[PDB]
């Protein structure tokens, strides 16, 4: 607007808007899991979601969601947390890899098959 | 009063939009050259220069068609003070695919886009009319 006003100062982009604060710009981080409690979502979607809060190696304290039917992980398992997005429980935006370092792949999973980590039938 | 030629072409867009027969202007050299170009391309019909309060004046009659329809389908000042747009010879910007014309004031005077192309000189634009 009034191009000398842009020669003075103007027209810069807004903000990087970083999605995940896992850290480092790293795709997945292994982590020590603690207190694997099960929660209640927002009002149109009522169920019990199986989350676990994980202390990423990156020293931060986050809370990840465990996809699949059940979780092999108990207290102090070395779960490999990737970044995802679950709308449904507020503040949980990370998903634990199933078929990983500690948490075994989902058993009798026969159709989804890459997610949930089920190895092929012999 | 900050731009002379913007008031010129502005007065041609208003007098063209409001179905006028003629228009009156403060005469100057650059407006005389632009009036001579728009004579030579036929966007206006003819202009005459009067003597008036103090200075001379430019009375342009506008060229209409087979009914009330207009020949100048627009003006747009591009080499405006504050962002005076310069043009090398590679491209005298083509206007409306070539159907419109570009009043370009090179070192040889004032030319159109086509004359700036063939004679091999560029160095300005001014407003371009279609």
């Amino acid at each position: 607007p009034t191009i000398q006003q842009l020669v003075r100062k103007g027209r810069r982009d807004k903000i990087a808007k970083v999605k995940t604060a896992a850290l480092k710009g790293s795709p997945q981080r292994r982590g020590v899991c603690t207190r694997v409690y099960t929660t209640t979502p927002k009002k149109p979607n009522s169920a019990l979601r199986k989350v676990a809060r994980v202390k990423l190696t990156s020293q931060v304290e986050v809370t990840a969601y465990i996809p699949g039917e059940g979780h092999n992980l108990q207290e102090h398992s070395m779960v490999l947390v990737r970044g995802g997005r679950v709308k449904d429980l507020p503040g949980v935006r990370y998903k634990i890899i199933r078929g990983s370092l500690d948490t075994q792949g989902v058993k009798n999973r026969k159709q989804a098959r890459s997610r949930y980590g089920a190895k092929k039938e012999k | 009063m900050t731009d002379p030629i913007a008031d010129f072409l502005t007065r041609l867009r208003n007098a063209n939009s409001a179905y006028h027969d003629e228009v009156t202007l403060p005469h100057s050299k650059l407006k005389a050259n632009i009036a001579e170009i728009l004579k030579r391309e036929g966007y206006i019909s003819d202009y005459r220069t009067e003597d008036a309060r103090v200075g001379k004046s430019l009375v342009v009659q506008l060229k209409y068609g087979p009914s009330r329809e207009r020949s100048i389908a627009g003006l747009r000042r591009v080499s405006k003070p504050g962002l005076r747009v310069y043009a090398k010879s590679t491209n005298l910007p083509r206007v409306l695919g070539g159907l419109g014309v570009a009043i370009i004031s090179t070192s040889s005077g004032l030319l159109t886009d086509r004359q700036a192309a063939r004679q091999g000189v560029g160095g300005e634009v001014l407003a371009y009319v279609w």
């Binding site: - | 391309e41 036929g42 068609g65 020949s71 409306l96 695919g97 070539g98 159907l99 419109g100 086509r114």
Partner: protein
């Protein structure tokens, strides 16, 4: 628009002349609250045209979908619109505006293809163009981009018309490449036309 494939032993399906190209752009059920509930109706934005470059724009209101489509066909039938071209291209870059609909319609060299979004792609696929280059800026809609595209095609004019407005002998109105494209397109009009006579 379902269950159209049918064979009838009746009087006639009344198939006849004017086998034009007809495109249905969008259908959104339009609701109206009245005392005790909602009254659903239907709007069909109907594009019709022939491959010369004559375009219609129809806007059908009915509480059935093929009824609204047929009323859009009859309304665009009532209201056609001539589009000037060069070969199968467009003449020169324009911008059309229907109150929020911005569409830039720019020509291109032949072979490129109609590159436009779905509303402008509909209005240009019904028309006589095969190779132009458009874009729909603003308003993110179907009705305003169709109507803005038709206003953009109203800002078109012939090279000859421009020459006529300025009282100048062509050559003197166009540049030369576009006159050569006039020679190419009229030459293939002569070839396919004289192959049409025999």
């Amino acid at each position: 628009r379902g269950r159209r494939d049918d064979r009838g032993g009746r009087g006639r399906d009344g198939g006849d002349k004017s086998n034009y190209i007809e495109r249905v752009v969008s259908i959104n059920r339009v609701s109206k609250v009245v005392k005790g509930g909602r009254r659903f109706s239907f709007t069909a934005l109907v594009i019709v045209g022939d491959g010369k470059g004559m375009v219609g724009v129809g806007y059908g209101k009915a509480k059935e979908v093929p009824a609204a489509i047929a009323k859009g066909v009859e309304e665009a039938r009532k209201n056609f619109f001539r589009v000037p071209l060069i070969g199968s291209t467009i003449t020169h870059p324009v911008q059309g505006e229907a109150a929020a609909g911005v569409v830039m319609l720019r020509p291109a060299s032949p072979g490129t293809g109609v590159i436009a979004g779905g509303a402008a792609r509909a209005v240009l696929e019904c028309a006589g163009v095969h190779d132009i280059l458009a874009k729909s800026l603003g308003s993110d809609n179907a009705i305003n981009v169709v109507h803005a595209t038709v206003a953009a095609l109203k800002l078109l004019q012939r090279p000859e018309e421009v020459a006529a407005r300025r009282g100048l002998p062509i050559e003197d109105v166009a540049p030369a490449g576009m006159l050569k494209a006039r020679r190419e397109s009229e030459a293939l009009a002569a070839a396919a036309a004289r192959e049409g006579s025999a």
